[PDB]
Amino acid sequence: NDLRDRILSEPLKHADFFNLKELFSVRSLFDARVHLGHKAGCRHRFMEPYLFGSRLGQDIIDLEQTAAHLQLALNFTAHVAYREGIILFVSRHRQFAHLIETTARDCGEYAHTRYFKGGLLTNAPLLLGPGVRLPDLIIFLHTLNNVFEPHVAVRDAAKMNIPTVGIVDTNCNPALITYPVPGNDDSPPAVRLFCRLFQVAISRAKEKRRQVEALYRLQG
Amino acid sequence: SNEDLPVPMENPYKEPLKKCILCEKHVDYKNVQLLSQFISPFTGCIYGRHITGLCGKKQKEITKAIKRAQILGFMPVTYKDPAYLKDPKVCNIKYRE
Amino acid sequence: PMKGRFPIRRTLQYLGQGDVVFKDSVKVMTVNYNTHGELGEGARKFVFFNIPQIQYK
Amino acid sequence: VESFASMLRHSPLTQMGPAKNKLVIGQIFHIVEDDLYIDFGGKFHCVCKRPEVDGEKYQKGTRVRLRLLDLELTSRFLGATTDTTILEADAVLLGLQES
Amino acid sequence: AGSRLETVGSIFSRTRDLIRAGVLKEKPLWLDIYNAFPPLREPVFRRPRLRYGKAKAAVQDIFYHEDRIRAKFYSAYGSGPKAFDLFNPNFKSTCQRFVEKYIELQRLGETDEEKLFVEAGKALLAEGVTLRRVG
Amino acid sequence: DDFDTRILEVRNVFNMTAKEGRKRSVRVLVAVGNGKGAAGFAIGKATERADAFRKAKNRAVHYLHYIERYEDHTIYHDISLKFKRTHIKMKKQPRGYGLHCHRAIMTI
Amino acid sequence: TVDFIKKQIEEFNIGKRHLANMMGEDPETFTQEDIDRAIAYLFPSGLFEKRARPIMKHPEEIFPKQRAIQWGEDGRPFHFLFYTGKQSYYSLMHDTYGKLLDVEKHHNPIGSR
RNA sequence: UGCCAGCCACCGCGGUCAUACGAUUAACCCAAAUUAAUAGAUCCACGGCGUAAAGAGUGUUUAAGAAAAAAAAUCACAAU
Ligand SMILES: [Mg+2]
Ligand SMILES: [Mg+2]
Ligand SMILES: [Mg+2]
Ligand SMILES: [Mg+2]
Ligand SMILES: [Mg+2]
Ligand SMILES: [Mg+2]
Ligand SMILES: [Mg+2]
Ligand SMILES: [Mg+2]
Ligand SMILES: [Mg+2]
Ligand SMILES: [Mg+2]
Ligand SMILES: [Mg+2]
Ligand SMILES: [Mg+2]
Ligand SMILES: [Mg+2]
Ligand SMILES: [Mg+2]
Ligand SMILES: [Zn+2]
């Protein structure tokens, strides 16, 4: 009992514990096109702070803020993975469907990229099974449905006390998402980037978990 | 102290504003050729903006000009003067297909 | 009270609380004040807050 | 360290300026029979139709010449709050990565 | 159970407080992690109100003096004969060269546009680029 | 076992069914709370009223608010709140002064 | 429900022997073909609907297939598509699409329905 | 007893199986008082005025008031 408390509480004292600082740069995000938004016409009203400014009608995210945010997001993701809990990626976006499953399957994490049945998280035990565990963390690579409303899962995760980490875009509404990352959802370099990053954070959390378990076993 | 920030200048790439075919021309009721250019040949109708494609002020100008040309009788009402049927055609109408 | 823009001054409490009492000699008091100027500014307030205190007492 | 603002100021997407009638280089990453989906790198891909000249020359991975019309396709419509996105940009096909 | 109210406050609020009332007997994971590293703003719900009247946005449009030059460049020659690449992070276009030459002839202390523009054009002529010269 | 429930409003509600003519539903609005500051309410509706009492119970545990109490009895400061054609106003009392309220609000 | 399948298959075999020994056949070469004749002669129901006639069959043909346990004893689900609510479908879909993609990278009326 | 005889402050009850009538039987609540009646105390709006009761058919001024700075530019042309 004592040493398990030790194993879980130890990583919280170190801001870097999974050492993700090196996993990207502002240059990196810059070549992954993250800094591009939609036309100023399609902008949401709640992106006004996260934006940098309008270049000839096209809006541009603040990459400094992107890094500050994404850091915290990835850190969070990791600390959940290490603590051995469910992670569910979600996107409706078609171009990237395959990626996101192919990503998630390799993380030992789950994706839901599909039509999203309505009562899914809200009414779990009826939909999924007689009693069931629910995603510990939900992670959106797009915040939208193909009809350009907010994906149900946002309202629902938020409804269920699940934390949420997702990429807001200039048109999207950030406000219900626990940890946002402002950034471009549309360009494939960007999706790929975010994919592989959450992938890696997961992998490192899992490895580090295994390790500290082995050390736990030598100490005993 | 950041010299690489953006400047609060006006838009340099700004496209010059479009012009009615008459912008700063002079519409007189005296040149019936000009006024004939904006009238339907068979009717003697006056084409609307959505055909002529003129500014507000130039449409209005043309219209009044025409009506003047009709009452003073430099120009007829119910048909385009034949002399001017063979002149350059400005408007976007396709009658004959 | 609801209407009025500084309704606290249509109270009874605000009226009792203002303190000036006048000597027995005072009979008339004449406030001449000015609408437009920065240098009028104080005087105006006096009319708007304090005059209704004064009178009550 | 580079400040983000600096990265922005010196980027090609900035240098290009207005989108109309720009001559751009692009790459074909996906194909449906007549239609070739071209990333020129901007944000959204544009779409094209395979020309009659040398049909089989344009394939997945091929590079292409584009005349960029609009960086993206958008307009506001009757009784709309936000404008409507096609999630594509408008471009024309010139020749294929003329080398 | 718990509290499904999406409007009331952040998940942090509801969860912390429902535990505080000892209704929720099991502290959830993300909770502790959250306490450790909270996000910038609490994830609280906001009606997305429309703007009326005189209210505009806070966005600053993005312009450089480089652009005030480029305007004139495109005003003369058009888009560069070399085309463009958005894949190559270091790409310099005909335009950018022109801007540089013009910056150096500005550091040469010439205030007249004709001189600046034309001589920069001569520098790029000496660099072997083809200037189409469209009216 | 800590949660008390009280029925706030039971009401007979009707509908128009092509088949049946009128169709009679019961809807009960019900609140729940443990006395320790967390509480909530829900609506529930069914043909047979017993069924509906049940429904509101269970649905109401799903929406709980934490209600912060000063020194564990009063509210913190006065609240004047207009909500949809109904105005609520509530003053914060000292200790000997028990619950002076609309009967519903007493219950809650 | 799996304990039911174990039990039922056991009792099915024990009753199989029991059937052969009374019907007087070698328990080894006894087939379903023989099972049918057997019951049909023992419990002769004239009935038109043929499912309501007596049956002794291997529980697998009797009972429907079941969906297996979808999560470990930790609560954690095995398949990554579980939260789609149809994993079975979208797995076929993921695989099919994968096959397609690989075909695209690699590539550079018999009475069949 | 059967839309009759009757009752109710409001909603209402009596048309054959009335806890609403009349009478029993139990209860309830007041109590040297109890009900009924009629007058009071109390009771609107510091709320409203598109659809609910309510912005006058229109302008200017008197009486009476309210007041930081900006507050006359032009017909896109059909006042009288
Ligand atoms: Mg009778
Ligand atoms: Mg009777
Ligand atoms: Mg009665
Ligand atoms: Mg009686
Ligand atoms: Mg008495
Ligand atoms: Mg009152
Ligand atoms: Mg109103
Ligand atoms: Mg009315
Ligand atoms: Mg009246
Ligand atoms: Mg009026
Ligand atoms: Mg009047
Ligand atoms: Mg009238
Ligand atoms: Mg006066
Ligand atoms: Mg004023
Ligand atoms: Zn004009």
PDB file of N, CA, C and O in Angstrom, chain E residues 58-81:
ATOM      1  N   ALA E  58     -10.564  42.393 -31.588  1.00  0.00           N
ATOM      2  CA  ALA E  58      -9.306  42.885 -31.043  1.00  0.00           C
ATOM      3  C   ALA E  58      -8.135  42.473 -31.922  1.00  0.00           C
ATOM      4  O   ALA E  58      -6.981  42.761 -31.597  1.00  0.00           O
ATOM      5  N   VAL E  59      -8.427  41.786 -33.026  1.00  0.00           N
ATOM      6  CA  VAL E  59      -7.365  41.275 -33.873  1.00  0.00           C
ATOM      7  C   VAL E  59      -6.640  42.427 -34.546  1.00  0.00           C
ATOM      8  O   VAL E  59      -7.244  43.422 -34.960  1.00  0.00           O
ATOM      9  N   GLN E  60      -5.322  42.306 -34.585  1.00  0.00           N
ATOM     10  CA  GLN E  60      -4.491  43.272 -35.264  1.00  0.00           C
ATOM     11  C   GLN E  60      -4.127  42.696 -36.613  1.00  0.00           C
ATOM     12  O   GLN E  60      -3.553  41.617 -36.696  1.00  0.00           O
ATOM     13  N   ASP E  61      -4.463  43.408 -37.675  1.00  0.00           N
ATOM     14  CA  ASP E  61      -4.081  42.965 -39.003  1.00  0.00           C
ATOM     15  C   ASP E  61      -2.559  42.950 -39.115  1.00  0.00           C
ATOM     16  O   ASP E  61      -1.864  43.625 -38.355  1.00  0.00           O
ATOM     17  N   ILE E  62      -2.039  42.181 -40.060  1.00  0.00           N
ATOM     18  CA  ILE E  62      -0.605  41.970 -40.134  1.00  0.00           C
ATOM     19  C   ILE E  62       0.047  42.557 -41.390  1.00  0.00           C
ATOM     20  O   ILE E  62      -0.171  42.080 -42.507  1.00  0.00           O
ATOM     21  N   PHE E  63       0.852  43.601 -41.187  1.00  0.00           N
ATOM     22  CA  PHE E  63       1.538  44.294 -42.283  1.00  0.00           C
ATOM     23  C   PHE E  63       2.976  44.745 -41.945  1.00  0.00           C
ATOM     24  O   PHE E  63       3.255  45.163 -40.819  1.00  0.00           O
ATOM     25  N   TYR E  64       3.869  44.682 -42.936  1.00  0.00           N
ATOM     26  CA  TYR E  64       5.252  45.156 -42.803  1.00  0.00           C
ATOM     27  C   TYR E  64       5.527  46.209 -43.865  1.00  0.00           C
ATOM     28  O   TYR E  64       4.754  46.345 -44.811  1.00  0.00           O
ATOM     29  N   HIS E  65       6.611  46.963 -43.724  1.00  0.00           N
ATOM     30  CA  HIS E  65       6.944  47.949 -44.748  1.00  0.00           C
ATOM     31  C   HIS E  65       7.430  47.245 -46.006  1.00  0.00           C
ATOM     32  O   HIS E  65       7.283  47.746 -47.148  1.00  0.00           O
ATOM     33  N   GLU E  66       7.990  46.062 -45.776  1.00  0.00           N
ATOM     34  CA  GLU E  66       8.334  45.145 -46.846  1.00  0.00           C
ATOM     35  C   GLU E  66       7.150  45.004 -47.798  1.00  0.00           C
ATOM     36  O   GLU E  66       7.317  45.002 -49.018  1.00  0.00           O
ATOM     37  N   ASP E  67       5.950  44.919 -47.226  1.00  0.00           N
ATOM     38  CA  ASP E  67       4.721  44.776 -48.000  1.00  0.00           C
ATOM     39  C   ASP E  67       4.408  46.022 -48.828  1.00  0.00           C
ATOM     40  O   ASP E  67       3.918  45.920 -49.952  1.00  0.00           O
ATOM     41  N   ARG E  68       4.692  47.197 -48.272  1.00  0.00           N
ATOM     42  CA  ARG E  68       4.465  48.452 -48.986  1.00  0.00           C
ATOM     43  C   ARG E  68       5.359  48.536 -50.219  1.00  0.00           C
ATOM     44  O   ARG E  68       5.003  49.150 -51.226  1.00  0.00           O
ATOM     45  N   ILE E  69       6.527  47.914 -50.130  1.00  0.00           N
ATOM     46  CA  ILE E  69       7.345  47.729 -51.328  1.00  0.00           C
ATOM     47  C   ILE E  69       6.775  46.686 -52.300  1.00  0.00           C
ATOM     48  O   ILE E  69       6.615  46.955 -53.503  1.00  0.00           O
ATOM     49  N   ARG E  70       6.499  45.491 -51.771  1.00  0.00           N
ATOM     50  CA  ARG E  70       6.013  44.361 -52.571  1.00  0.00           C
ATOM     51  C   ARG E  70       4.825  44.770 -53.418  1.00  0.00           C
ATOM     52  O   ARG E  70       4.669  44.310 -54.544  1.00  0.00           O
ATOM     53  N   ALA E  71       3.989  45.634 -52.851  1.00  0.00           N
ATOM     54  CA  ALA E  71       2.847  46.196 -53.554  1.00  0.00           C
ATOM     55  C   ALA E  71       3.288  46.773 -54.882  1.00  0.00           C
ATOM     56  O   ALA E  71       2.667  46.533 -55.915  1.00  0.00           O
ATOM     57  N   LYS E  72       4.376  47.532 -54.840  1.00  0.00           N
ATOM     58  CA  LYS E  72       4.880  48.201 -56.022  1.00  0.00           C
ATOM     59  C   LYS E  72       5.552  47.206 -56.937  1.00  0.00           C
ATOM     60  O   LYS E  72       5.493  47.338 -58.163  1.00  0.00           O
ATOM     61  N   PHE E  73       6.185  46.200 -56.348  1.00  0.00           N
ATOM     62  CA  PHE E  73       6.793  45.170 -57.173  1.00  0.00           C
ATOM     63  C   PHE E  73       5.754  44.440 -58.026  1.00  0.00           C
ATOM     64  O   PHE E  73       5.936  44.271 -59.236  1.00  0.00           O
ATOM     65  N   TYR E  74       4.678  43.993 -57.387  1.00  0.00           N
ATOM     66  CA  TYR E  74       3.595  43.308 -58.077  1.00  0.00           C
ATOM     67  C   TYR E  74       2.853  44.269 -58.978  1.00  0.00           C
ATOM     68  O   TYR E  74       2.220  43.868 -59.955  1.00  0.00           O
ATOM     69  N   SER E  75       2.926  45.547 -58.625  1.00  0.00           N
ATOM     70  CA  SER E  75       2.368  46.597 -59.457  1.00  0.00           C
ATOM     71  C   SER E  75       3.133  46.695 -60.779  1.00  0.00           C
ATOM     72  O   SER E  75       2.551  47.039 -61.810  1.00  0.00           O
ATOM     73  N   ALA E  76       4.430  46.385 -60.753  1.00  0.00           N
ATOM     74  CA  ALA E  76       5.230  46.418 -61.982  1.00  0.00           C
ATOM     75  C   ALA E  76       5.280  45.076 -62.703  1.00  0.00           C
ATOM     76  O   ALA E  76       4.666  44.901 -63.751  1.00  0.00           O
ATOM     77  N   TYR E  77       6.032  44.138 -62.142  1.00  0.00           N
ATOM     78  CA  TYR E  77       6.325  42.873 -62.814  1.00  0.00           C
ATOM     79  C   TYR E  77       5.264  41.768 -62.663  1.00  0.00           C
ATOM     80  O   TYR E  77       5.101  40.932 -63.554  1.00  0.00           O
ATOM     81  N   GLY E  78       4.535  41.780 -61.548  1.00  0.00           N
ATOM     82  CA  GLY E  78       3.604  40.708 -61.230  1.00  0.00           C
ATOM     83  C   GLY E  78       4.243  39.730 -60.261  1.00  0.00           C
ATOM     84  O   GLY E  78       5.211  40.082 -59.584  1.00  0.00           O
ATOM     85  N   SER E  79       3.703  38.515 -60.172  1.00  0.00           N
ATOM     86  CA  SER E  79       4.344  37.465 -59.380  1.00  0.00           C
ATOM     87  C   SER E  79       5.612  37.013 -60.092  1.00  0.00           C
ATOM     88  O   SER E  79       5.654  36.980 -61.328  1.00  0.00           O
ATOM     89  N   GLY E  80       6.638  36.669 -59.312  1.00  0.00           N
ATOM     90  CA  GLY E  80       7.948  36.322 -59.847  1.00  0.00           C
ATOM     91  C   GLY E  80       7.937  35.234 -60.909  1.00  0.00           C
ATOM     92  O   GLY E  80       7.089  34.339 -60.872  1.00  0.00           O
ATOM     93  N   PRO E  81       8.871  35.313 -61.874  1.00  0.00           N
ATOM     94  CA  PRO E  81       9.031  34.318 -62.951  1.00  0.00           C
ATOM     95  C   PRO E  81       9.514  32.933 -62.455  1.00  0.00           C
ATOM     96  O   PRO E  81       9.416  31.937 -63.182  1.00  0.00           O
TER      97      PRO E  81
END
